[PDB]
Structure formats: structure tokens, C-alpha cells
Amino acid sequence: RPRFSFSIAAREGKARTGTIEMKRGVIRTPAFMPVGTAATVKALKPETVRATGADIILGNTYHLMLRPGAERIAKLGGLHSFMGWDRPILTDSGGYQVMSLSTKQSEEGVTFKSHLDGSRHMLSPERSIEIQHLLGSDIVMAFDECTPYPATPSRAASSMERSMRWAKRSRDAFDSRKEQAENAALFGIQQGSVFENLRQQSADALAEIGFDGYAVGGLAVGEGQDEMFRVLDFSVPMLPDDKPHYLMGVGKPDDIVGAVERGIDMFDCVLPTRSGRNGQAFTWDGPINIRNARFSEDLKPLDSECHCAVCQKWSRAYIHHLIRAGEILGAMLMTEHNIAFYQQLMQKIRDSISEGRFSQFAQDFRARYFA
Amino acid sequence: RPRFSFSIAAREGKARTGTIEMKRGVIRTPAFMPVGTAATVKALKPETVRATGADIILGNTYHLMLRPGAERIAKLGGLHSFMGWDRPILTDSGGYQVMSLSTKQSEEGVTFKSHLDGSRHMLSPERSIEIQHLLGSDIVMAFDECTPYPATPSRAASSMERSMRWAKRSRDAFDSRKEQAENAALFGIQQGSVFENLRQQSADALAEIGFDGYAVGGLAVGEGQDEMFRVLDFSVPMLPDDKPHYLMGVGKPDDIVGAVERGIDMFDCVLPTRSGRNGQAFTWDGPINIRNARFSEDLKPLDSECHCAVCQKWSRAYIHHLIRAGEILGAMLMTEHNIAFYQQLMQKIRDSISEGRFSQFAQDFRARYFA
Numbered sequence: 001r002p003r004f005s006f007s008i009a010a011r012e013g014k015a016r017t018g019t020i021e022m023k024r025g026v027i028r029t030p031a032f033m034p035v036g037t038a039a040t041v042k043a044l045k046p047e048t049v050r051a052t053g054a055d056i057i058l059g060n061t062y063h064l065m066l067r068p069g070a071e072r073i074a075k076l077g078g079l080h081s082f083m084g085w086d087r088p089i090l091t092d093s094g095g096y097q098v099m100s101l102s103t104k105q106s107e108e109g110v111t112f113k114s115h116l117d118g119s120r121h122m123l124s125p126e127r128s129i130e131i132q133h134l135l136g137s138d139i140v141m142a143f144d145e146c147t148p149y150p151a152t153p154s155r156a157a158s159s160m161e162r163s164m165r166w167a168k169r170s171r172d173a174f175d176s177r178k179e180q181a182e183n184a185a186l187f188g189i190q191q192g193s194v195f196e197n198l199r200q201q202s203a204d205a206l207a208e209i210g211f212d213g214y215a216v217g218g219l220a221v222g223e224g225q226d227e228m229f230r231v232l233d234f235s236v237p238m239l240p241d242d243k244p245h246y247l248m249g250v251g252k253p254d255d256i257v258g259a260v261e262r263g264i265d266m267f268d269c270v271l272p273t274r275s276g277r278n279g280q281a282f283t284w285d286g287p288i289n290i291r292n293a294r295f296s297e298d299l300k301p302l303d304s305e306c307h308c309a310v311c312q313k314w315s316r317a318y319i320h321h322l323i324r325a326g327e328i329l330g331a332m333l334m335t336e337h338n339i340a341f342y343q344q345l346m347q348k349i350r351d352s353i354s355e356g357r358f359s360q361f362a363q364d365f366r367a368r369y370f371a
Numbered sequence: 372r373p374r375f376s377f378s379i380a381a382r383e384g385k386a387r388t389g390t391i392e393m394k395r396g397v398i399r400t401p402a403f404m405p406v407g408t409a410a411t412v413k414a415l416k417p418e419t420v421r422a423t424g425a426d427i428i429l430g431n432t433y434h435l436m437l438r439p440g441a442e443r444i445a446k447l448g449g450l451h452s453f454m455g456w457d458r459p460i461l462t463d464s465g466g467y468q469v470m471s472l473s474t475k476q477s478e479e480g481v482t483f484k485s486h487l488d489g490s491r492h493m494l495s496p497e498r499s500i501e502i503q504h505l506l507g508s509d510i511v512m513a514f515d516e517c518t519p520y521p522a523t524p525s526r527a528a529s530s531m532e533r534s535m536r537w538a539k540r541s542r543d544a545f546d547s548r549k550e551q552a553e554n555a556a557l558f559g560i561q562q563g564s565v566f567e568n569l570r571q572q573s574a575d576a577l578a579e580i581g582f583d584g585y586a587v588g589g590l591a592v593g594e595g596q597d598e599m600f601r602v603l604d605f606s607v608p609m610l611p612d613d614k615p616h617y618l619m620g621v622g623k624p625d626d627i628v629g630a631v632e633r634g635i636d637m638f639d640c641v642l643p644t645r646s647g648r649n650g651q652a653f654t655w656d657g658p659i660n661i662r663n664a665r666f667s668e669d670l671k672p673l674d675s676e677c678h679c680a681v682c683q684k685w686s687r688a689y690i691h692h693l694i695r696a697g698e699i700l701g702a703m704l705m706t707e708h709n710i711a712f713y714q715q716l717m718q719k720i721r722d723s724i725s726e727g728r729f730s731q732f733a734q735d736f737r738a739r740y741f742a
């Protein structure tokens with residue numbers, strides 16, 4: 001099987017659909033990656049994650065380096081063996097969580113205090129890559145410096161420039177590890193805040209280094225959908241067309257559809273899992289709050305067109321009861337349904353692009369979802 | 372299919388093994404019933420409960436009458452449909468929880484305040500039977516008055532006598548409901564605390580009324596194993612031999628083995644589910660606390676002879692991590708393993724009795740479990 005082979009089977013406007021072939025499996029694009037931060041997609045066995053249609057999941061360098069620890073995971077046989085997921089895993093590099101959850105920053109990297117116990121740790125391009133090697137992930141993210149929003153052009157520029165130096169260091173560290181270079185892929189992260197000239201400079205620097213894929217970083221950090229879409233409008237075309245484009249930490253269903261319309265191939269977000277546990281279910285007519293009294297005697301499934309196992313077997317009324325009672329099975333069923341909904345959305349996106357009817361799909365989807 | 376047909380296939384001493392045939396399935400005895408108090412066996416889908424080997428689960432009249440409500444469950448199609456478990460369900464009558472979790476007691480019944488919101492409710496033999504009819508349970512428990520431990524002989528006698536009057540009222544209420552009388556079974560509950568003469572009077576009263584099965588009530592309420600076993604020694608032989616004998620709210624694996632040696636056919640307890648969520652796993656070498664540091668790098672499964680799906684797929688080290696991190700999947704995996712362990716114990720009990728080697732099994736089991 002190939003290390004990394006991206007094929008585009010069809011286009012419609014800026015939208016693309018295709019496949020990434022890797023040693024542990026094929027990833028159908030556009031793809032949604034369930035988030036499995038602490039070596040679990042919360043409340044789901046791996047087999048259930050797969051049954052929803054997911055091809056790849058996300059793990060987090062920052063959380064796993066603290067608990068259970070990267071060298072421990074490697075000693076236990078790697079992340080895939082540890083958690084029982086044998087398909088591809090993408091790991092974020094830690095650079096965002098170190099800033100959001102922990103700190104001393106310099107050109108070498110970041111030192112920080114753990115949010116679990118205040119112990120001191122270090123991340124750097126070289127250490128992030130080494131941790132991801134120890135975990136055994138299939139798609140490795142370059143280590144970046146995250147730019148707060150809003151930022152002055154000058155602060156966004158200096159942060160982007162450091163990120164680009166760290167991208168080169170990440171490339172070199174990855175290429176020095178034969179096992180990683182032979183079996184994994186490395187993605188670079190474009191920065192530059194909302195500024196077109198900086199996004200261009202960042203894209204140029206990343207392409208000069210060369211990566212297997214390119215993430216648009218620094219968005220979905222408080223700017224709102226209109227601004228995110230404006231930035232994607234000019235930023236995605238700057239990236240190499242022939243490699244996957246990954247929008248990190250996005251998003252709501254309508255964010256996904258609009259980002260695909262702008263050339264994004266891959267997504268991750270905690271929304272389906274987190275909001276499932278908190279009682280929000282996604283439906284083709286928009287989200288519902290299952291705890292609401294209107295569902296107490298509703299025998300319909302969460303969504304009456306959903307193909308998932310939850311909607312084949314249990315009612316809104318039952319799941320309403322479970323969530324109100326604090327029952328673990330409520331979190332399990334809501335999470336399975338939401339991840340399945342996201343995967344069915346991605347499938348409809350892929351099919352509509354392949355069939356040359358994605359523009360109509362997006363319009364039909366919005367009209368109903370927001371009615 | 373029969374409403375209720377109990378067959379004893381084999382005996383060894385006072386131990387029996389056999390089957391209870393009911394309309395929704397066969398119950399192999401001795402049987403362990405996972406507890407599904409609030410219309411869920413905590414952290415398990417019904418299909419997973421079945422996959423562990425369980426033939427029947429327990430629901431609770433007290434909890435379900437408060438949330439979601441008995442008439443609501445009936446309007447939604449009954450408890451089996453509501454929760455997605457299509458095999459037999461036994462429901463306790465509410466008489467113990469009303470005293471332990473809520474109260475005004477009289478000959479008519481009990482009035483009490485809900486533990487959820489302080490609202491006022493009533494239970495009586497007639498209302499308990501009606502609630503169990505609305506739920507649709509397959510085995511209905513008579514409504515009893517629970518005797519605290521310790522109790523004077525005179526207080527135990529007056530409580531037992533009231534329970535026997537309530538047993539007759541339960542019988543009559545059940546027999547007045549054609550649907551229930553045709554499709555469900557009714558069990559009576561022996562009382563009398565630790566006193567042989569009262570246990571005899573209680574057994575005689577229950578047999579005169581006539582029930583499909585007989586529970587030994589009022590034990591495992593603080594008296595300890597030695598005293599519980601002493602009382603079982605004389606109490607079980609007083610019950611009709613040709614009907615199932617049910618020990619309610621028991622227990623640890625060694626409690627089960629000793630109770631089977633004394634003629635008990637059926638058990639329920641929250642221990643495997645509750646202690647699973649709290650990090651205690653049952654093994655053939657005794658319980659382990661999976662959170663203990665000694666398991667942090669242990670690649671063995673929870674138990675290296677267990678047949679369950681958890682022990683085929685995940686290590687102690689992984690489950691240790693999950694429970695320490697507060698992850699729902701930890702509770703799911705620990706609970707599945709513990710319920711599977713209990714079912715494998717019951718299977719070994721059944722096979723050993725059938726094969727005339729239960730005495731040796733019990734000795735071998737204890738020697739290892741307590742080594």
C-alpha cells in the first residue's frame with residue numbers, strides 16, 4: 001500500500017472529491033475526522049466509530065504527551081494498538097493547545113505548565129515531531145505558533161514567519177526519522193491571520209519546503225463565518241492544488257459545506273461529540289436540544305432519514321429520558337448519531353461533487369437546515 | 372411459548388440447574404440479572420448486555436414511576452420497546468427503594484416524597500402491580516414491607532405479617548388483570564428477618580397464596596455473609612422446591628456461589644455495573660482496582676481467561692488510562708467485562724451442577740479467588 005497518494009476524482013468549481021491512500025487505509029475526501037483527543041473518541045468504541053463511516057480520526061500531541069505519555073504509548077506498541085483503532089490517525093502538533101490550555105515562548109519552542117498538575121514540559125518542532133513518531137501517527141502536523149485574533153498585521157507577520165521557520169524545522173526532523181519518512185505523511189500549516197499578503201507569503205514558504213498536505217491554520221478562532229469564508233476565498237487557491245487542504249477545528253455543518261465550496265478537503269471538530277454529550281443532536285432540519293420537553297413522548301428517531309444504528313433502534317423520547325437522567329447510554333447514543341450524521345453529510349458532499357450537482361446540494365441543504 | 376415453565380434439569384446437594392421458559396425467552400438458572408434501574412443497564416446497549424450472556428434484566432418500579440413515569444412508558448409501548456430489550460424483564464415492586472431512597476407507612480401502603488424533587492407519591496400492593504402492568508414486565512414482584520436489620524422478633528413478626536397480607540393483595544391485583552395473568556409471572560417475597568419461626572410462617576403464608584417463584588427478602592442488608600448463609604440454610608428449604616428461588620440484591624461472586632449451594636436460582640446486584648464504573652474489575656484471581664499504578668504498563672487484558680470482547684481487544688494499561696482520565700469508554704469497557712465475568716461465573720455454576728462437579732467447582736473457585 002502507498003505511504004501517501006492523493007487522487008482527485010472530480011471537481012465542481014473549487015470543490016474537489018477524491019481519495020488519500022495510506023498504508024493503514026483509504027481516506028475519502030472531503031473527509032471529517034472525529035476527534036479522539038485522549039486516545040478515545042469520547043463514548044464510542046473504535047468499531048462504532050468505523051461503523052459510522054469514519055476513515056481517519058484525530059489525536060492530540062499535547063494531551064497524549066501529558067497522559068499517558070508519548071514514550072509510554074510507544075512502549076505499549078503505539079497509539080493504534082493502545083486504543084484499538086487500526087486505520088489512519090492524524091495528530092495535531094500541540095502548538096494550539098499549549099497556548100489555549102496551559103507558558104514561555106521563544107524561537108526554540110514553548111515551555112509550559114501542564115493543566116493537569118502544573119508540571120513543566122517543553123515543545124519544539126523537533127520534540128513535537130518526535131512525540132508524533134512515538135505515537136505512530138500516520139499524518140503528522142508541523143509544529144506552529146498560533147496567532148490570536150484579532151492581530152495587528154505586524155504581529156501576524158512575525159508569528160507567521162516564526163511558524164514558517166518552525167515548519168522547515170518540522171520537515172527536517174520528520175525527514176531525519178526513516179521510519180516516519182517511509183510510513184507517515186507531513187502536513188504544513190499556513191498562517192497569516194486575515195491578511196492576504198501574509199497568507200500568500202506563508203503559502204509560498206510552505207510550498208518551497210514541500211509538504212504532503214497543507215492546512216489553513218489560524219481560522220475559526222473568533223472571527224465568525226463571514227470573515228472565515230472571506231479569508232478562505234483567497235487563501236486556499238494559494239496552496240498547491242495537487243495536495244489535500246485541511247481546515248483545522250471546523251465545524252458546524254454549514255461551515256463544512258461552505259469550506260468545501262472554497263476548496264477544503266479535510267476537517268476535524270469536537271462539535272458532534274461534545275454537543276452530543278450535552279444533548280444537542282444534528283438533524284437535516286437543524287440541531288435539536290433533545291432534553292427539551294417537546295421530545296418527552298416523541299417516538300420518532302433523532303432524525304427520520306438518518307441511516308445510523310441509533311435511529312434504527314431508539315426514539316427521541318428514550319434518548320431524552322437518558323440525557324435528562326445523566327445516563328452514560330444517552331451520551332453514547334447521541335454521540336454515535338452525531339458522528340454518523342457528520343459522516344452522512346460528508347458522503348452526500350462527496351457524491352454530489354462526483355456527480356456534478358454539489359451547488360444544488362449546498363443550496364438544498366441550507367434551505368432545509370436553516371428552515 | 373409458555374407464560375412460565377420452570378424445569379430442573381439436574382441437582383447437586385441443594386443446588387439446582389435448569390430453565391425458566393417465558394414468552395420473551397428462556398432464562399438459564401442459576402441466573403444473574405444485570406440491573407437496569409432507570410431503563411438502562413448503565414453504560415451498555417441492550418445488544419451488549421445480551422452478548423455477555425444475560426437472559427433477563429431487572430428494572431425498578433420506584434425509579435421508573437418517578438422518571439419517566441409508568442403511564443408514559445405504557446403510552447410509548449412498554450418498557451421493552453422503550454429501552455430496546457426484547458427478552459424478559461423482572462421488576463422489583465418499589466417497597467425497598469421507597470424506604471431506602473425517599474415517608475408515611477400504613478396498612479394501605481406507603482406515601483413518600485420523591486428523591487428527585489420532593490413530589491408526593493403513593494405505593495400500595497394494588498398500585499405497584501398496576502405500575503408493573505403498565506411497564507409490561509415479565510416477572511412481577513409482590514409489594515412488601517422491608518424489615519430493617521437488626522430487628523426485634525416482635526417487630527420482624529409484625530412486618531412479616533403485613534408483608535404477607537400485602538402478598539395476598541398483590542396476588543389478587545395481578546390476577547384481576549387478564550393481560551398480566553396470561554403473559555407475566557408473579558413472585559412472592561419471604562420475610563422474617565433472621566428468625567427461623569418467622570421465616571417458616573412467611574413461607575407457609577406464601578405457599579398458601581401460591582406464586583410462580585419465591586424470593587428470600589430481607590437479607591444482604593448489613594448482617595454479613597455468615598449470618599446470611601445461616602438464614603439461607605433453614606429458609607430456602609421452606610419454600611416450594613418446584614419453583615424458582617430468588618435472592619434479591621446479592622452479590623459478590625462468593626456470595627452467589629454459597630447461595631447456589633443453599634438452593635438459590637436467581638440473583639440481581641448492582642455490584643458489577645457500579646464497581647465497574649468506579650474502577651474495580653472482577654477476575655478469577657479476585658477483584659483488581661484498575662486505576663492502581665501497577666497496571667499502567669500492563670498489556671494483559673483485565674483477565675487472561677475471560678471470553679468477553681473487552682478482554683479480546685484492550686489491555687489493562689489502556690483501561691487504566693481511560694478510568695483515570697474520566698473517559699466514558701472506560702466505564703463502558705469495565706462494565707461490559709464485569710457483567711460478562713458474572714455471566715461466565717453463572718455458566719460455570721450451571722455446567723458444574725449439570726455435570727455433578729459443583730462442589731469441586733466451588734472449592735476450586737474459592738481457593739483461587741481468595742488466593
Ligand SMILES: N=C(N)NOCC[C@H](N)C(=O)O
Pocket residue numbers: 092093094095096141144146189216217218219220221247248249250
Ligand atoms: N494550529 C494548530 N496546530 N491546530 O489547529 C487548531 C485549530 C484552529 N482552528 C487553527 O486552525 O489553528
Ligand SMILES: N=C(N)NOCC[C@H](N)C(=O)O
Pocket residue numbers: 463464465466467512515517560587588589590591592618619620621
Ligand atoms: N424487598 C424488595 N422488594 N427488594 O429487595 C431488595 C434487596 C434486599 N437484599 C432484600 O432482599 O429485601
Ligand SMILES: [Zn+2]
Pocket residue numbers: 302303306307308309310311337338340341
Ligand atoms: Zn441517526
Ligand SMILES: [Zn+2]
Pocket residue numbers: 673674677678679680681682708709711712
Ligand atoms: Zn473480560
